[PDB]
Short mmCIF file of C-alpha atoms and ligand atoms in Angstrom, two decimals:
data_model
loop_
_atom_site.label_atom_id
_atom_site.label_comp_id
_atom_site.label_asym_id
_atom_site.label_seq_id
_atom_site.Cartn_x
_atom_site.Cartn_y
_atom_site.Cartn_z
CA UNK A 1 -6.84 10.87 94.78
CA UNK A 2 -8.28 14.33 96.14
CA UNK A 3 -5.34 16.99 97.37
CA UNK A 4 -6.95 20.50 98.12
CA UNK A 5 -6.36 23.56 96.36
CA UNK A 6 -2.90 25.36 97.68
CA UNK A 7 -1.22 24.15 94.07
CA UNK A 8 -0.92 27.11 92.02
CA UNK A 9 -0.47 27.09 88.52
CA UNK A 10 2.10 29.59 87.03
CA UNK A 11 1.86 29.32 83.11
CA UNK A 12 -1.58 29.22 80.87
CA UNK A 13 -1.00 27.05 78.13
CA UNK A 14 -4.28 27.72 76.19
CA UNK A 15 -8.07 28.94 76.88
CA UNK A 16 -10.80 25.66 75.16
CA UNK A 17 -14.15 26.01 74.80
CA UNK A 18 -14.88 23.99 78.41
CA UNK A 19 -12.41 25.29 81.04
CA UNK A 20 -8.73 26.25 80.72
CA UNK A 21 -5.61 24.00 80.71
CA UNK A 22 -2.75 25.80 82.91
CA UNK A 23 1.54 24.54 83.74
CA UNK A 24 1.70 24.69 87.14
CA UNK A 25 4.22 22.86 90.08
CA UNK A 26 2.40 20.27 92.55
CA UNK A 27 4.14 19.12 96.00
CA UNK A 28 7.11 22.07 95.14
CA UNK A 29 9.32 20.42 92.19
CA UNK A 30 6.86 18.26 90.26
CA UNK A 31 6.58 20.05 86.78
CA UNK A 32 2.28 19.49 86.81
CA UNK A 33 -0.17 20.40 83.54
CA UNK A 34 -3.28 21.18 85.46
CA UNK A 35 -6.35 21.28 83.42
CA UNK A 36 -9.26 23.43 85.12
CA UNK A 37 -12.77 22.83 84.09
CA UNK A 38 -14.84 25.87 84.78
CA UNK A 39 -18.43 25.79 86.26
CA UNK A 40 -19.84 24.14 83.16
CA UNK A 41 -21.53 20.84 84.05
CA UNK A 42 -18.98 19.77 86.83
CA UNK A 43 -20.52 16.27 88.44
CA UNK A 44 -18.62 17.17 91.46
CA UNK A 45 -20.35 13.43 91.97
CA UNK A 46 -20.63 11.65 89.06
CA UNK A 47 -17.06 13.00 88.18
CA UNK A 48 -15.60 11.29 91.76
CA UNK A 49 -17.38 7.99 90.21
CA UNK A 50 -14.69 8.75 87.26
CA UNK A 51 -11.83 6.71 89.30
CA UNK A 52 -11.56 4.62 85.86
CA UNK A 53 -9.80 7.07 83.93
CA UNK A 54 -6.80 6.69 86.61
CA UNK A 55 -7.72 3.04 87.43
CA UNK A 56 -6.25 0.91 84.87
CA UNK A 57 -6.14 3.67 82.52
CA UNK A 58 -2.74 3.73 82.97
CA UNK A 59 -0.35 3.18 79.55
CA UNK A 60 2.15 4.33 77.54
CA UNK A 61 0.03 6.53 75.64
CA UNK A 62 -2.07 7.50 77.75
CA UNK A 63 -2.07 11.05 79.81
CA UNK A 64 -1.05 9.55 83.28
CA UNK A 65 -3.38 11.56 85.82
CA UNK A 66 -2.15 12.71 88.91
CA UNK A 67 -5.35 13.98 91.14
CA UNK A 68 -8.22 15.69 91.02
CA UNK A 69 -10.25 18.30 92.87
CA UNK A 70 -13.63 17.92 94.08
CA UNK A 71 -16.12 24.09 92.62
CA UNK A 72 -14.24 24.11 89.67
CA UNK A 73 -11.59 21.30 88.82
CA UNK A 74 -7.99 21.30 88.50
CA UNK A 75 -7.12 17.67 86.75
CA UNK A 76 -3.54 17.39 87.36
CA UNK A 77 -1.94 15.45 84.82
CA UNK A 78 1.91 14.94 83.69
CA UNK A 79 3.54 18.09 81.44
CA UNK A 80 3.72 17.24 77.70
CA UNK A 81 6.58 19.33 76.01
CA UNK A 82 5.17 19.79 72.37
CA UNK A 83 1.65 20.57 73.59
CA UNK A 84 -1.38 18.95 70.57
CA UNK A 85 -0.57 17.43 68.15
CA UNK A 86 -2.50 19.93 66.21
CA UNK A 87 -0.69 22.59 67.16
CA UNK A 88 2.69 20.45 66.27
CA UNK A 89 1.45 20.07 62.84
CA UNK A 90 0.53 23.62 62.43
CA UNK A 91 3.94 24.89 63.81
CA UNK A 92 7.39 24.80 62.79
CA UNK A 93 8.05 21.28 63.18
CA UNK A 94 5.20 20.23 60.24
CA UNK A 95 8.14 21.38 57.76
CA UNK A 96 10.30 18.48 58.66
CA UNK A 97 7.69 15.71 59.49
CA UNK A 98 7.42 13.31 57.03
CA UNK A 99 5.24 9.91 56.41
CA UNK A 100 7.83 7.97 58.61
CA UNK A 101 7.30 10.03 61.56
CA UNK A 102 3.56 10.65 60.75
CA UNK A 103 2.76 6.91 60.64
CA UNK A 104 4.50 5.84 63.95
CA UNK A 105 2.67 8.78 65.26
CA UNK A 106 -0.64 7.01 64.36
CA UNK A 107 0.53 3.59 65.59
CA UNK A 108 1.27 5.09 68.83
CA UNK A 109 -2.22 6.94 68.74
CA UNK A 110 -4.02 3.56 67.38
CA UNK A 111 -1.88 1.43 71.02
CA UNK A 112 -3.19 3.71 73.52
CA UNK A 113 -6.77 3.53 71.79
CA UNK A 114 -5.72 -0.15 71.72
CA UNK A 115 -5.76 -0.22 75.30
CA UNK A 116 -8.89 1.72 75.42
CA UNK A 117 -10.17 -0.93 73.45
CA UNK A 118 -8.95 -3.87 75.29
CA UNK A 119 -10.41 -2.61 78.71
CA UNK A 120 -14.04 -2.55 76.87
CA UNK A 121 -13.94 1.56 77.62
CA UNK A 122 -15.13 4.50 75.01
CA UNK A 123 -13.14 7.91 74.22
CA UNK A 124 -16.07 9.70 73.09
CA UNK A 125 -13.99 12.05 71.54
CA UNK A 126 -10.59 11.42 69.31
CA UNK A 127 -8.75 14.29 67.43
CA UNK A 128 -5.62 15.67 66.35
CA UNK A 129 -6.10 18.23 69.81
CA UNK A 130 -6.72 15.78 72.06
CA UNK A 131 -3.65 14.22 71.59
CA UNK A 132 -0.47 15.57 73.17
CA UNK A 133 2.99 15.13 71.80
CA UNK A 134 6.34 15.07 74.02
CA UNK A 135 9.39 15.01 72.63
CA UNK A 136 11.01 12.41 70.44
CA UNK A 137 7.62 12.25 68.91
CA UNK A 138 5.42 10.83 72.05
CA UNK A 139 1.84 11.22 71.22
CA UNK A 140 -0.59 10.18 74.27
CA UNK A 141 -3.79 10.38 74.38
CA UNK A 142 -5.74 12.77 76.30
CA UNK A 143 -9.40 13.85 76.90
CA UNK A 144 -11.15 10.63 77.06
CA UNK A 145 -13.21 11.04 80.06
CA UNK A 146 -16.15 13.38 79.06
CA UNK A 147 -19.41 12.28 78.90
CA UNK A 148 -21.95 15.38 79.91
CA UNK A 149 -19.21 19.62 69.06
CA UNK A 150 -16.97 18.46 66.61
CA UNK A 151 -19.28 17.06 63.81
CA UNK A 152 -16.63 16.63 61.32
CA UNK A 153 -14.62 13.91 64.05
CA UNK A 154 -17.64 12.10 65.09
CA UNK A 155 -19.28 8.39 63.40
CA UNK A 156 -22.60 9.14 61.69
CA UNK A 157 -24.16 6.44 63.87
CA UNK A 158 -23.47 8.63 66.97
CA UNK A 159 -23.62 12.02 65.45
CA UNK A 160 -27.52 10.98 64.61
CA UNK A 161 -28.95 8.38 67.03
CA UNK A 162 -26.47 9.08 69.90
CA UNK A 163 -24.34 5.52 69.68
CA UNK A 164 -21.05 5.93 71.01
CA UNK A 165 -19.26 2.97 70.73
CA UNK A 166 -14.99 1.88 69.83
CA UNK A 167 -16.06 1.47 66.52
CA UNK A 168 -17.15 5.15 66.42
CA UNK A 169 -13.49 6.08 67.12
CA UNK A 170 -12.41 4.05 64.73
CA UNK A 171 -14.28 6.54 62.69
CA UNK A 172 -12.41 9.60 63.96
CA UNK A 173 -9.41 7.71 64.31
CA UNK A 174 -9.70 7.44 60.57
CA UNK A 175 -10.57 11.61 60.61
CA UNK A 176 -7.29 12.16 62.89
CA UNK A 177 -4.95 10.21 59.91
CA UNK A 178 -6.17 13.36 57.73
CA UNK A 179 -4.83 15.52 60.12
CA UNK A 180 -1.28 13.60 60.43
CA UNK A 181 -1.30 13.53 56.74
CA UNK A 182 -2.30 17.35 55.83
CA UNK A 183 -0.67 18.70 58.65
CA UNK A 184 -3.45 19.81 61.05
CA UNK A 185 -5.63 20.92 58.24
CA UNK A 186 -9.80 21.23 59.16
CA UNK A 187 -11.04 18.05 57.63
CA UNK A 188 -13.92 18.02 54.94
CA UNK A 189 -12.11 21.61 53.69
CA UNK A 190 -15.28 23.97 52.35
CA UNK A 191 -18.27 22.51 54.01
CA UNK A 192 -20.01 23.58 57.40
CA UNK A 193 -21.01 20.92 60.28
CA UNK A 194 -24.25 20.63 58.39
CA UNK A 195 -23.03 20.34 54.42
CA UNK A 196 -21.02 17.24 56.45
CA UNK A 197 -24.27 15.13 57.56
CA UNK A 198 -26.11 15.22 54.39
CA UNK A 199 -22.86 14.27 52.17
CA UNK A 200 -21.72 11.09 54.13
CA UNK A 201 -25.34 9.69 54.73
CA UNK A 202 -24.94 9.90 50.96
CA UNK A 203 -21.94 8.06 50.38
CA UNK A 204 -19.26 10.92 50.28
CA UNK A 205 -15.88 10.45 51.53
CA UNK A 206 -12.86 12.09 51.78
CA UNK A 207 -10.30 11.94 48.93
CA UNK A 208 -6.77 11.12 49.22
CA UNK A 209 -4.81 13.66 50.79
CA UNK A 210 -1.81 15.18 48.02
CA UNK A 211 1.44 13.19 48.24
CA UNK A 212 -0.61 9.96 50.29
CA UNK A 213 -0.24 6.60 49.59
CA UNK A 214 -3.56 4.96 49.01
CA UNK A 215 -2.70 2.35 50.92
CA UNK A 216 -3.09 4.86 53.32
CA UNK A 217 -6.20 6.22 52.35
CA UNK A 218 -8.00 3.11 52.12
CA UNK A 219 -7.16 2.29 55.85
CA UNK A 220 -9.29 5.66 56.33
CA UNK A 221 -11.96 4.10 54.34
CA UNK A 222 -11.72 0.54 56.29
CA UNK A 223 -12.31 3.41 59.19
CA UNK A 224 -15.22 4.89 57.15
CA UNK A 225 -17.16 2.10 56.64
CA UNK A 226 -21.34 2.77 57.13
CA UNK A 227 -21.48 -0.54 58.49
CA UNK A 228 -19.79 0.29 62.80
CA UNK A 229 -19.21 -3.59 63.52
CA UNK A 230 -17.38 -4.02 60.16
CA UNK A 231 -14.58 -1.23 61.10
CA UNK A 232 -11.28 -2.56 61.82
CA UNK A 233 -10.43 -3.03 64.94
CA UNK A 234 -7.15 -0.44 66.83
CA UNK A 235 -5.17 -3.76 67.56
CA UNK A 236 -5.64 -4.49 63.30
CA UNK A 237 -4.77 -0.23 62.97
CA UNK A 238 -2.07 -0.72 65.48
CA UNK A 239 -0.77 -3.75 63.65
CA UNK A 240 -1.44 -1.96 60.34
CA UNK A 241 1.15 1.18 61.13
CA UNK A 242 3.69 -0.73 62.79
CA UNK A 243 4.79 -3.01 59.78
CA UNK A 244 3.43 -0.58 57.15
CA UNK A 245 7.10 0.63 55.44
CA UNK A 246 7.82 -3.08 55.51
CA UNK A 247 4.31 -4.99 54.85
CA UNK A 248 2.18 -2.57 52.94
CA UNK A 249 4.73 0.28 51.14
CA UNK A 250 8.00 -1.07 50.85
CA UNK A 251 8.85 1.62 48.27
CA UNK A 252 7.61 4.33 49.35
CA UNK A 253 10.36 7.15 49.04
CA UNK A 254 10.51 10.60 51.13
CA UNK A 255 8.58 13.17 48.89
CA UNK A 256 9.07 16.88 49.49
CA UNK A 257 6.03 16.68 52.09
CA UNK A 258 5.14 13.53 52.62
C1 1E8 B 1 -1.46 25.52 72.36
C2 1E8 B 1 -1.75 24.23 72.01
C3 1E8 B 1 -1.65 22.90 73.27
O1 1E8 B 1 -0.73 22.53 73.07
N1 1E8 B 1 -2.78 22.99 73.60
C4 1E8 B 1 -3.73 24.11 74.08
C5 1E8 B 1 -4.35 24.22 75.20
C6 1E8 B 1 -4.23 23.11 76.38
C7 1E8 B 1 -2.80 22.00 75.98
N2 1E8 B 1 -3.18 21.06 77.32
N3 1E8 B 1 -3.78 20.55 77.77
C8 1E8 B 1 -3.78 19.33 78.56
C9 1E8 B 1 -4.67 18.49 79.45
C10 1E8 B 1 -3.42 18.32 80.73
C11 1E8 B 1 -4.72 17.71 81.30
C12 1E8 B 1 -6.05 17.38 81.36
O2 1E8 B 1 -6.69 16.10 81.94
C13 1E8 B 1 -6.79 14.89 81.20
C14 1E8 B 1 -8.18 15.23 81.02
C15 1E8 B 1 -8.91 14.02 79.70
C16 1E8 B 1 -8.16 13.12 79.38
C17 1E8 B 1 -7.13 13.25 80.05
C18 1E8 B 1 -6.42 14.16 81.10
C19 1E8 B 1 -6.24 17.30 79.84
C20 1E8 B 1 -5.57 18.42 79.15
C21 1E8 B 1 -2.16 19.32 77.88
C22 1E8 B 1 -0.61 18.72 78.51
N4 1E8 B 1 -0.49 17.82 79.22
N5 1E8 B 1 0.36 18.94 77.86
C23 1E8 B 1 0.30 20.33 77.59
N6 1E8 B 1 -0.79 20.79 77.01
C24 1E8 B 1 -2.04 20.06 77.57
C25 1E8 B 1 -2.29 21.71 74.71
#
């Protein structure tokens, strides 16, 4: 799956903490997004044993990996039009995104994470910046396999005792639910990365966002339960969001924000 580094990048989509991501072409006609990884902790060997990212991790709502170079890498994947969900919520599209759209995008994310769950895999960092948005509201999970930081998204079990499991990503899915229902705003508004750990251990949970039904805030608190194994399945989360406007909020009327 290793092609050589003679397919070159055109447009730089953005810069992040660990490497760059570019927009380019592959074999002359395929439009392709290429994530570069600078000399951070490039596991030129333990990175190529990452043959599972690409094997049977092919799902509708997972970003389809195409190829990898074996120096600095260029993870070759599909090109998602609207970029990251975080920008799509902050941007101009936020003005017209309502709850039915936000809950559909949450259902898609749960679907792809339900696939990662069925495959007994773990995605150690799930948030709105690691989810890509195409057109017609297609969300896909990206950035799943990086082991080698967002404390406001990580479950308390995994920040203090390194216990990352699929239930740990349920926790951040709940935090991600707040990003959808606040149009990209930063969780625990007003607090800092260590002020958050004191409050979560003491029992503090984020209140109900404005205009958001408590039906959906209760689903966050199920994802924010102290005991990991009592947090809901991604199978349950997917079905819950898929049926939401029929089994849970049939009296929902579209407001001015949600
Ligand atoms: C400036 C705001 C905005 O939108 N951003 C911010 C700047 C970067 C932009 N970015 N990155 C990717 C991408 C492409 C391939 C990839 O390999 C995987 C790594 C781990 C797991 C799965 C794949 C990782 C990320 C990417 C992409 N497809 N499509 C659009 N934008 C992307 C999004």
